[PDB]
Amino acid sequence: HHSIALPAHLRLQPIYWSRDDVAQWLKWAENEFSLRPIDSNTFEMNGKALLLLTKEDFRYRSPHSGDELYELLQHILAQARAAFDLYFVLDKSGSVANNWIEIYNFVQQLAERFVSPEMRLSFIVFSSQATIILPLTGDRGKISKGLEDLKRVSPVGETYIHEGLKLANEQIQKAGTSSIIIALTDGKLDGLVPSYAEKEAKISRSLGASVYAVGVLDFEQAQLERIADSKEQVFPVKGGFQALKGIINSILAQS
């Protein structure tokens, strides 16, 4: 449903709004609802901070329209739906043993940035065999415990990424919402695993999933390009916040 005809730029979940986005929301709300002038500094904060405020905080900051803006923000929350199922397919090979912390801190940060409702996460580790650490769940308690298990992972073995994608595809097929696959690896595949993994990524796209690849160490951009949907969905783990921001904005723009 869409009882409120929200503009496209404000259709993003408010938890991802920036300070400027909050300001644009005030300008839109002021005209759409014939409200009195609203200073653009009534809420000098991002959407994530705005969601922690109380209706009393709205009444104080905006005596003329604070109550209306709060109820407007609540109706927006009840319409802006994520519905993203994120599948982390993490390389726990011996080759990436010294960089597992990178893989972990990258997954941990995205899980915190992806804490919006209707967004469920899943953790899959692969080496010589594949294992599901965290099944697809929106429960933050299970997500928190899964991150604890990812920290205790002892990297060792080969790089059979097709085994990890199969675990993602099966879940995606069983549960069906945009399914997203975030594969963190160096793309160093031995034997026919390159063909196996690219064949398994076609099945993911056949299942309606979007395959992202985050490379670690001296990764093979080529191998990651073929697995991912395109070169634009291949990001470096060393990119830091930029890459984190890029992947999330790209994932959010999928829906």
Numbering used by the authors: 10 to 185, 189 to 267
What does the report in the manuscript say about this coordinate set?
However, when the pH decreases below 7, TELSAM forms a six-subunit-per-turn helical polymer that can enable fused target proteins to co-crystallize. TELSAM reduces the entropic cost of crystal nucleation and growth by pre-freezing some degrees of freedom in the crystal lattice. Additionally, pre-ordering many thousands of copies of the target protein along the polymer results in substantial avidity to strengthen the subsequent target protein–target protein interactions that are formed when adjacent TELSAM polymers associate.
No twinning, pseudo-translation or TELSAM-polymer flipping was detected in diffraction data sets from these SUMO tag-free constructs. The interface of vWa with the vWa domain of an adjacent polymer buries 188 Å2 of solvent-accessible surface area. Specifically, the side chain of Gln138 in the vWa domain interacts with the side chain of Asn114 in the adjacent vWa domain. Additionally, the side chains of Glu111 and Asn107 in the vWa domain interact with the side chains of Pro144 and Thr140 in the adjacent vWa domain. The vWa domain also contacts a second vWa domain, burying 144 Å2 of solvent-accessible surface area. Specifically, the side chain of Ser207 in the vWa domain makes weak contacts with the side chain of Ala265 in this second vWa domain. Prior to cooling, this crystal was briefly (∼10 s) exposed to iodine vapour to label exposed tyrosine side chains. We were also able to resolve the main-chain atoms of two of the histidine residues in the 10×His tag.
